[PDB]
PDB file of C-alpha atoms and ligand atoms in Angstrom:
ATOM      1  CA  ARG A   1       6.370  19.786   2.888  1.00  0.00           C
ATOM      2  CA  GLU A   2       6.259  19.703   6.752  1.00  0.00           C
ATOM      3  CA  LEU A   3       7.864  17.635   9.593  1.00  0.00           C
ATOM      4  CA  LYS A   4       6.155  14.192   9.920  1.00  0.00           C
ATOM      5  CA  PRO A   5       3.876  14.003  13.068  1.00  0.00           C
ATOM      6  CA  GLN A   6       3.462  11.169  15.655  1.00  0.00           C
ATOM      7  CA  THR A   7       1.834   7.766  14.896  1.00  0.00           C
ATOM      8  CA  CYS A   8      -1.956   7.377  14.965  1.00  0.00           C
ATOM      9  CA  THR A   9      -2.907   6.301  18.540  1.00  0.00           C
ATOM     10  CA  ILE A  10      -5.894   4.273  17.219  1.00  0.00           C
ATOM     11  CA  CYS A  11      -4.933   2.296  14.003  1.00  0.00           C
ATOM     12  CA  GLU A  12      -1.086   2.715  14.327  1.00  0.00           C
ATOM     13  CA  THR A  13      -0.859   3.692  10.568  1.00  0.00           C
ATOM     14  CA  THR A  14       1.780   6.501  10.648  1.00  0.00           C
ATOM     15  CA  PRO A  15       0.252   9.765   9.215  1.00  0.00           C
ATOM     16  CA  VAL A  16       2.425  11.799   6.766  1.00  0.00           C
ATOM     17  CA  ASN A  17       1.168  15.285   7.701  1.00  0.00           C
ATOM     18  CA  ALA A  18      -0.981  17.192  10.291  1.00  0.00           C
ATOM     19  CA  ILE A  19      -4.220  17.156   8.170  1.00  0.00           C
ATOM     20  CA  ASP A  20      -3.886  13.369   7.600  1.00  0.00           C
ATOM     21  CA  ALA A  21      -2.983  12.863  11.322  1.00  0.00           C
ATOM     22  CA  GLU A  22      -6.028  14.768  12.694  1.00  0.00           C
ATOM     23  CA  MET A  23      -8.384  13.170  10.137  1.00  0.00           C
ATOM     24  CA  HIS A  24      -7.033   9.814  11.352  1.00  0.00           C
ATOM     25  CA  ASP A  25      -7.608  10.638  15.034  1.00  0.00           C
ATOM     26  CA  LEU A  26     -11.134  11.436  13.947  1.00  0.00           C
ATOM     27  CA  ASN A  27     -12.139   8.443  11.794  1.00  0.00           C
ATOM     28  CA  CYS A  28     -10.189   5.884  13.801  1.00  0.00           C
ATOM     29  CA  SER A  29     -12.080   6.983  16.942  1.00  0.00           C
ATOM     30  CA  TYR A  30     -15.185   5.758  14.965  1.00  0.00           C
ATOM     31  CA  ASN A  31     -13.222   2.851  13.276  1.00  0.00           C
ATOM     32  CA  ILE A  32     -13.823   4.142   9.684  1.00  0.00           C
ATOM     33  CA  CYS A  33     -11.008   4.235   7.042  1.00  0.00           C
ATOM     34  CA  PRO A  34      -9.533   7.804   6.699  1.00  0.00           C
ATOM     35  CA  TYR A  35      -9.486   7.294   2.901  1.00  0.00           C
ATOM     36  CA  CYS A  36     -12.362   4.950   1.793  1.00  0.00           C
ATOM     37  CA  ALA A  37     -14.745   5.226   4.860  1.00  0.00           C
ATOM     38  CA  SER A  38     -15.006   1.402   5.136  1.00  0.00           C
ATOM     39  CA  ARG A  39     -16.641   1.332   8.661  1.00  0.00           C
ATOM     40  CA  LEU A  40     -14.163  -1.105  10.189  1.00  0.00           C
ATOM     41  CA  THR A  41     -14.174  -2.650  13.720  1.00  0.00           C
ATOM     42  CA  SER A  42     -11.798  -1.669  16.579  1.00  0.00           C
ATOM     43  CA  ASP A  43      -9.556  -4.673  15.581  1.00  0.00           C
ATOM     44  CA  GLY A  44     -10.225  -4.465  11.772  1.00  0.00           C
ATOM     45  CA  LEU A  45      -9.037  -0.827  11.897  1.00  0.00           C
ATOM     46  CA  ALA A  46      -5.319  -1.414  12.353  1.00  0.00           C
ATOM     47  CA  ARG A  47      -5.177  -4.196   9.711  1.00  0.00           C
ATOM     48  CA  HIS A  48      -7.246  -2.192   7.187  1.00  0.00           C
ATOM     49  CA  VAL A  49      -5.727   1.270   7.699  1.00  0.00           C
ATOM     50  CA  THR A  50      -2.296  -0.519   7.305  1.00  0.00           C
ATOM     51  CA  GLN A  51      -3.462  -2.116   3.960  1.00  0.00           C
ATOM     52  CA  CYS A  52      -5.985   0.296   2.253  1.00  0.00           C
ATOM     53  CA  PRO A  53      -4.988   1.345  -1.324  1.00  0.00           C
ATOM     54  CA  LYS A  54      -7.024   4.658  -1.270  1.00  0.00           C
ATOM     55  CA  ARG A  55      -4.639   5.633   1.553  1.00  0.00           C
ATOM     56  CA  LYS A  56      -1.807   6.047  -1.003  1.00  0.00           C
ATOM     57  CA  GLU A  57      -4.049   8.043  -3.412  1.00  0.00           C
ATOM     58  CA  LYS A  58      -5.388  10.550  -0.820  1.00  0.00           C
ATOM     59  CA  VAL A  59      -1.987  10.792   0.792  1.00  0.00           C
ATOM     60  CA  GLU A  60      -0.230  11.488  -2.535  1.00  0.00           C
ATOM     61  CA  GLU A  61      -2.930  14.239  -2.646  1.00  0.00           C
ATOM     62  CA  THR A  62      -1.743  15.446   0.851  1.00  0.00           C
ATOM     63  CA  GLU A  63       1.749  15.907  -0.678  1.00  0.00           C
ATOM     64  CA  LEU A  64      -0.144  18.634  -2.709  1.00  0.00           C
ATOM     65  CA  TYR A  65      -1.898  20.095   0.377  1.00  0.00           C
ATOM     66  CA  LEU A  66      -1.894  23.464  -1.498  1.00  0.00           C
ATOM     67  CA  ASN A  67      -5.326  22.298  -2.883  1.00  0.00           C
ATOM     68  CA  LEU A  68      -8.788  23.131  -1.536  1.00  0.00           C
ATOM     69  CA  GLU A  69      -9.781  19.832   0.176  1.00  0.00           C
ATOM     70  CA  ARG A  70      -8.550  18.474   3.575  1.00  0.00           C
ATOM     71  CA  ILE A  71     -11.169  16.026   4.993  1.00  0.00           C
ATOM     72  CA  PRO A  72     -13.807  14.873   2.371  1.00  0.00           C
ATOM     73  CA  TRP A  73     -16.040  13.607   5.245  1.00  0.00           C
ATOM     74  CA  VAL A  74     -16.944  17.089   6.722  1.00  0.00           C
ATOM     75  CA  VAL A  75     -18.528  18.602   3.561  1.00  0.00           C
ATOM     76  CA  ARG A  76     -22.222  17.454   3.423  1.00  0.00           C
ATOM     77  CA  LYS A  77     -25.508  18.512   1.660  1.00  0.00           C
TER      78      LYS A  77
HETATM   79 ZN1   ZN B 101      -5.427   5.978  12.371  1.00  0.00          ZN
HETATM   80 ZN1   ZN B 102      -9.659   2.153   3.414  1.00  0.00          ZN
END
């Protein structure tokens, strides 16, 4: 584990770790869920990133950050 970083400056959903926190600064800047890529609005963003259930699944995956994946939105083909 690592020391918990600052709150997301875009959706206000507190990130657990640095990977989750950067990913957030990235998808919230485009109002897309960090976890389900729901393509929110700038006022749907805070309410949805606060309530998404895929958030918990991906973030329980970030507790096992030792794995290969970080941001499943950057790998494309
Ligand atoms: Zn955010
Ligand atoms: Zn979501």
